[PDB]
From Swiss-Prot, chains A, B:
This is Alkaline phosphatase. Its cofactor is Mg(2+); Zn(2+). The active site is at S94. Belongs to the alkaline phosphatase family. Binds 1 Mg(2+) ion. Binds 2 Zn(2+) ions. Isozymes 1 and 3 are a dimer of identical chains, isozyme 2 is a dimer of heterogeneous chains, one of each of the subunits from isozymes 1 and 3. InterPro entries: Alkaline_phosphatase, Alkaline_phosphatase_AS, Alkaline_phosphatase_core_sf. It catalyses: a phosphate monoester + H2O = an alcohol + phosphate. Pfam families: Alk_phosphatase (PF00245). Zn(2+) 2 binds at D43, D361, H362.
Length: 441, 441
């Protein structure tokens, strides 16, 4: 626990520590192998986003019981490459970053599972599976989106969702041109044991070539032995997931719905609008599983493999609501993630051989600023759990989408080999940390 | 060393790690006493600021040999308190934040060494000196400015530089009303062995009461046994500093000039103005010591003391140039600090009983964004060491001054007790960390 000790107005009352950490920390260090790994990604979840969520939901002196509880921490850099020059491109997108931690190679913005030369490289999930480990890939995004796609698809543009877009935009990748296929087709080939998220829509396309031609990708999935679920009760009734019967959960047509609703930040909104309180999203049907519920089932199913498992969990819409300049949506998706993280830590603490990592793909726009701020972008005032006003500012785009930022950001870990996130590292080190911790080749 | 391995375009070439860190970090873990501490603060130096500076000066895959080299890292919270309510104020100023790590108690914005009830609390410097340790206080700001002033002064507003402003803004601290006096008067009473910075201007005022009434604060210093220096050569030639002959250096009227010149960011500056390369500041005379040089003399003089020393070093103008939306200024001052950090680490590695800590008082405005960004605030394109463009954005104030932000930010450390900065901590923990490390009371 790292909440404030007591009365934050008094001496020592805002302390998060109760005693010397040296012994505890020594004891947090083990370089025995990891049997399992859970990687949780908050898309766009930089320190700022963590801090704003913490402040709103738990109070400034509060503590995220998942997010904030990983004891080994550092900062890592997630710059991409300029595709022509090979030089750094200081602000990555989700595809280049996800490619870095999943393959160990930098690449250009938009690219999945390929380097700047457009050459494929195998992913941590593929190398898990090859070693006979169970594999999970979970996200609140449409499953074609960069973050989950990067683990199972090798394509020259992240827009290559299915056959249609792939033919037009990744001709080199398209099945009918002899390539590996669209992101959705490659996802079906990769056959992780557990794949849960949104993105049903693209499954309605029919393949233009290959063994399942003329059939929707949904049909292909059924033809190939996959159990399809599409809501929380059907997911919960699944009793196994393996190579003979892999699980594919499709819980929405595009992105899964956000947990909280609030208004969009506006010009001078912290000055001209009253403070806001977020509310649970009245549009999110109770029958859509949450990210922690997706995470439960995935852990439950994968932990059955005696050899071990690799699991990626993405809180995808932190980023998407940060783009939308929607503090409540943004914060709620961070709360959402913290719940999934608690699940992971609770399994990992009891199992004892599980390395859990929590970070983001890149930083974002949202800034916490003073209540009287007069800023040129979009702002909004929030009433926090402390009963004070926090203002959030989105000040880096005049267009309709607040943009990523280049700042290094937090990475934290618990479990075997967690030492390797500490100090300054690069996103590509995380690939090798994962590879090594599981003893893969 | 945590530079990129090799060819950042190739598998594994952006890695910062050369192998498994578990055993190295184990060996970084000592709970034996610290004999000395050196605390370096980059004012306004958030993770974004570090990143921008590294990107520019060392390249994206580069490594600050000082700043980036401390092996035990975490993230800390620095929210202040509303004076009336006692609730968190999510964006601190430099006075509340420096009060927190220097006394271990939160306070309101603009307060120095006092809590929200205006009650004094002892500082780590005062406590060091009482235990017989040598003490230094160094900064590129005027020495009355919040960050250095917090170690030696107790006032209700940070604006109470000398007798003149203290009588009218901090009437309860004014000497003529029976208070402890202005920041400058209290600074002189506290009598650190070594005190170096700017702020000569205020020493020209005359005291309104007390033993040295009717004399200038400069004459008071002389009369009280202090050796006064005003430039690098005179500073170089000092051979001792102690309670009989304490050292006070005053190297500028107000703030010391910055190291680098470049133009101010402007609206659409990344688009309408060409890329900038920073150059050295023609206004900074060579006779002005640098922060590293100040740090050198300080370390050398203070290390005479057999029992130990406490030293704080502030790269103060990272913040001020962030305020002024001036990337070359901001970056130059971060490079300046990295040098002073190198001095400190070199000294700690050789002496081996010294805890060194590098952090910031709070986060700031500057954001690294994409080259074609169209932002509503102030931007600028810069040519980095990698021969690529980085754009920087200042997007949270339509006034002449860009504003602090509340994100938690990096704290890093090296030496005995440095475990206590790892994970999530509060800025007030840092006080207690320092205190227990030095066995103080
Ligand atoms: Zn992203
Ligand atoms: Zn994503
Ligand atoms: Zn995004
Ligand atoms: Zn400051
Ligand atoms: Zn300062
Ligand atoms: Zn400031």
């Amino acid at each position: 626990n790292r909440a404030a000790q007591g009365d934050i107005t008094a001496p020592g009352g805002a302390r998060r520590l109760t005693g010397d950490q040296t012994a505890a920390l020594r004891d947090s260090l083990s370089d025995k192998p990891a049997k399992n790994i859970i990687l949780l990604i908050g898309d766009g979840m930089g320190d700022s986003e963590i801090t704003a969520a913490r402040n709103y939901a738990e109070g400034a002196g509060g503590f995220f019981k998942g997010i904030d509880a990983l004891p080994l921490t550092g900062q890592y850099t997630h710059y991409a490459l300029n595709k022509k020059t090979g030089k750094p491109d200081y602000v990555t997108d989700s595809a280049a970053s996800a490619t870095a931690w999943s393959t160990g190679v930098k690449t250009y913005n938009g690219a999945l599972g390929v380097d700047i030369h457009e050459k494929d490289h195998p992913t941590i999930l593929e190398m898990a599976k090859a070693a006979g480990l169970a594999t999970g890939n979970v996200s609140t995004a449409e499953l074609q989106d960069a973050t989950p796609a990067a683990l199972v698809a090798h394509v020259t543009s992240r827009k290559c969702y299915g056959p249609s877009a792939t033919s037009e935009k990744c001709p080199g990748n398209a099945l009918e041109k002899g390539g590996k296929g669209s992101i959705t087709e490659q996802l079906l080939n990769a056959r992780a044991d557990v794949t849960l998220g949104g993105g049903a829509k693209t499954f309605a396309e029919t393949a233009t070539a290959g063994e399942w031609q003329g059939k929707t990708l949904r049909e292909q999935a059924q033809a190939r032995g996959y159990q399809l679920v599409s809501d929380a009760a059907s997911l919960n009734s699944v009793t196994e997931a393996n190579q003979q019967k892999p699980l594919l959960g499709l819980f929405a047509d595009g992105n899964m719905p956000v947990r909280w609703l609030g208004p969009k930040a506006t010009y001078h909104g912290n000055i001209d609008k009253p403070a806001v309180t977020c509310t649970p999203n009245p549009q999110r049907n109770d029958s859509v599983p949450t990210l922690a519920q997706m995470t439960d089932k995935a852990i439950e199913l994968l932990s059955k493999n005696e050899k071990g498992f690799f699991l990626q969990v993405e809180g995808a819409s932190i980023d998407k609501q940060d783009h939308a300049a929607n503090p409540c949506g943004q914060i709620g998706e961070t709360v959402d993630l913290d719940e999934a993280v608690q699940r992971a830590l609770e399994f990992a603490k009891k199992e004892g051989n599980t390395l859990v990592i929590v970070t983001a793909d890149h930083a974002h726009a949202s800034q916490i600023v003073a209540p009287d701020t007069k800023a040129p972008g979009l702002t909004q005032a929030l009433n926090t759990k402390d009963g004070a006003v926090m203002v959030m500012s989105y000040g880096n785009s005049e267009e309709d989408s607040q943009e990523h930022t280049g700042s290094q950001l937090r990475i934290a870990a618990y479990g075997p080999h967690a030492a390797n996130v500490v100090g300054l590292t690069d996103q590509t080190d995380l690939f090798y940390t994962m590879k090594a911790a599981l003893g893969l080749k």
